[PDB]
Amino acid sequence: GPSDMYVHVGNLIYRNLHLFNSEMHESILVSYSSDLIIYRTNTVGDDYIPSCDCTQATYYCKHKNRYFPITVTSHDWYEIQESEYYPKHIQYNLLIGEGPCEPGDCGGKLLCKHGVIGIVTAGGDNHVAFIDLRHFHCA
């Protein structure tokens, strides 16, 4: 679902870490260095995470309730500074292009021609960052 702030492939859920409030489960994986939690759920999704290397993409902006086309660049690591909630740490496997960003936009799906490749994790003045989900998925 285009407006869904999470990624759902099969029985798996890919979701921002701080967007988690729910129950502890056996299948829960957590990447503190990527603000990502992965777990299994009872329902099934139609999302698909490709094993590609695309950069010509598009993503969902929540506070505008619309999709922006975007060209992104892959970063091995990047200094993600400190906001009120969490400190200035290092986040691995990021995607970055220019685009609008405002609080409450995390989970916004980023897609290429093959499927969902990431979700909004942070942004700044006219630049937005995504978790590269391709790294946390098997071909």
Contact string (CB under 6 A) for ligand S7Q, positions 58-97, x = contact: --------------------x-xx-x------------x-
Give me the least distance between CB of 101 and ligand S7Q, in Å please: 4
Please, is 79 exposed, middle or buried when counting C-beta atoms within 10 Å of its C-beta (0-12, 13-18, 19+)? exposed
Most distant CA pair in the chain, distance: 39
- Residue 130 makes CB contacts below 8 A (sequence gap 6+) with 59, 72, 94, 95, 96, 110, 117, 118, 119, 120, 121
- In this structure, the number of other CB atoms found within 10 A of the CB of residue 29 comes to 12
Residue 102 contacts which entry, a second copy, ligand S7N, ligand S7Q, none (Cβ below 5-8 A, type-dependent)? ligand S7Q
What is the C-alpha to C-alpha distance for residues 120 and 89, in angstroms, rounded to an integer? 17
Stretch that binds ligand S7N, among 21-29, 42-50, 76-84, 130-138 (CB under 6 A): 76-84
- Tell me which of 47, 61, 106, 132 is the catalytic residue: 106
Nearest to 131 by CA among 72, 86, 83, 56: 72
4 is catalytic: no
Nearer to Zn ion, 46 or 84 (CB): 46
Q: Residue 52, annotated ligand binder?
A: yes
Per-residue DSSP letters for 59-72? EEEGGGTEEEEEE-
Choosing from 35, 47, 105, 132, the catalytic residue is 35
Judged by the rule CB under 6 A, the positions of this chain that interact with ligand S7N are 16, 18, 78, 80-83, 86, 96, 103-106, 120-124, 127, 129
Binding site as annotated, residues for Zn(2+): 52, 54, 112, 114
So which residues are the catalytic ones?
18, 35, 106
